[PDB]
Design a protein around this ligand. Structure first.
Ligand SMILES: NCCCC[C@@](N)(CC[C@](N)(CCCCN)C(=O)O)C(=O)O
Ligand SMILES: [Mg+2]
Ligand SMILES: [Mg+2]
Ligand SMILES: [Mg+2]
Ligand SMILES: [Mg+2]
Lengths: 296, 296
């Protein structure tokens, strides 16, 4: 299978006067490239996919593809939806406009059954010829892609190559790789990046890497080389910021941190997301002081 | 406040060859009117709002409004979204096209904070002058509108008049009405329709009423008349079907039951929803035999 692995960043989407700041977006992607990141994920959960239009979703994918041209860095385009016809349309656009693969979140809100999840992802995978990474985050979607469903999709669909797990369930990570060791398990939960990698995971799709791309890149690379002492050390050092970046719903803390570090010009969200509380703003700022934050 | 209460039905959306069957939809709404229902909810969760287009969402609202003309039956239009700009647009269309109020589900997937939920619903409420019913269903959305947020929105926004609760939490129902007895608490959980009504709830937005509108209407109207003995009797009689209608994710079982009863011509969903397993298909058919299902 064609795969996209390694250290990856779920890119925030900066806004300026309620509009996608397209110049800042490219600048942020360049900073990720220059700090050892291997793939960028435009318009994931962290990129506020819910509140972008279908057009803006497509624009951000285009900026990512163009910015990564001439580099090793891959574009794993966020193209999921809770409507299969929407997810197929987004996947086809990403393929047609040069994305290296797609990240496709499990349908949210409408809670498909395991059979429905299978047909949803089968329709997506058969619509394009680029790699497809499943994305399980039951705390946000209200449903769970079971291990059996993931493994069936991996075995039945040529371009489905793994899953980004954001479920706080290391038991399931063992279940997945013990029964199907050929899939690419990707950490979608920064605090447990190292445990997932040490069990045979092959990458991360990170929130923290927006702020600290060099540290997340180093962690991942040490781990892929089985330098587990060094990878665990970085995972341990990162625990405090990894947790504080979820003191409110992601991406509220990470956008706050990027603003505090001078990496984005305005702390703007699209409703229903908004600025954090004054207390949490201060806690984010306090934890940031422990870490060395790369500029541009 | 202007309010919309009583026995209400979360309408299924019938499909024929992947298209909204508009004639079947109007016929189903008339059947609800003829069986004592006080309001209908087009394109809620049960109506597969997630997989309808914005335009099909607008078409079903028009059919509901047109079918209810010349009757007391109100149209409480499903107009929620996880993007505030989407929810405002849906609310404005519903108002402009004759809906009596809107049902607005809490944002799904992106998990707004309580502050974000407040600003989300304030923006919706300030965009129209018709009643707005909040809708809390954390098992599907991944977030919870707290009692404090619900009460603040009720007190601060003239047209926010209550909440549809589908959270399996009778403690919260006590919390809501003990601190704000002026709001309209609406049951969104058929099995516990009577306990919510007996605590001062003023209506239901029902899945089961799709199949048994006369029984849900009678239950609610008995309760509103403080004939709690007769209301509980119907609630107890309905428990078996109330639970089997969630043996798979709603609306998979209710559409299956409507098809088995001959009320819709095809068992068609839009992916990622699909037909139930053969076992659950048989379980639904078995539970239905206990009940008298009205025709057209
Ligand atoms: N990534 C950009 C697209 C965002 C669209 C949407 N906000 C809503 C998606 C939708 N399926 C639209 C249904 C519209 C008819 N009610 C949903 O709200 O479930 C989402 O998927 O979060
Ligand atoms: Mg097993
Ligand atoms: Mg090496
Ligand atoms: Mg209060
Ligand atoms: Mg309290």
């Amino acid at each position: 299978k064609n795969i996209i692995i390694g250290a990856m960043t779920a890119l925030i989407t900066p806004f300026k006067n309620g509009k996608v700041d397209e110049q800042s977006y490219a600048r942020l992607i360049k900073r990720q490239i220059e700090n050892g990141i291997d793939a960028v994920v435009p318009v994931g959960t962290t990129g506020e996919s819910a509140t972008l239009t279908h057009e803006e979703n497509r624009t951000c994918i285009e900026i990512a593809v163009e910015t990564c041209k001439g580099t090793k860095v891959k574009v794993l385009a966020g193209a999921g939806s809770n409507a299969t016809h929407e997810a197929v349309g987004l996947a086809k656009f990403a393929k047609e406009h040069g994305a290296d693969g797609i990240l496709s979140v499990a349908p949210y809100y409408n809670k498909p059954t395991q059979q429905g999840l299978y047909e949803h992802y089968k329709a997506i995978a058969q619509s394009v010829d680029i790699p497809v990474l499943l994305y399980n985050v039951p705390g946000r979607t209200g449903c769970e892609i079971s291990t059996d469903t993931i493994i069936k999709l991996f075995r039945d669909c040529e371009n489905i190559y793994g899953v980004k797990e954001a479920s706080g369930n290391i038991d399931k990570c063992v279940d997945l790789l013990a029964h199907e060791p050929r899939m690419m398990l990707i950490s979608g939960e920064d605090a447990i990046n190292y445990p997932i990698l040490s069990n045979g995971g092959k990458g991360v799709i990170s929130v923290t890497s927006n702020l600290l791309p060099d540290m997340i890149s180093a962690l991942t690379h040490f781990a892929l080389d089985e330098n587990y002492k060094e990878a665990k050390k970085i995972n341990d050092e990162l625990y405090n910021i990894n947790k504080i970046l979820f003191c409110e719903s992601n991406p509220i803390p990470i956008k706050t941190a990027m603003y505090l570090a001078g990496l984005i010009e305005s702390l703007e969200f699209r409703l229903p997301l908004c600025s954090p509380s004054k207390e949490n703003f201060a806690k984010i700022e306090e934890v940031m002081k422990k870490y060395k934050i790369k500029g541009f």
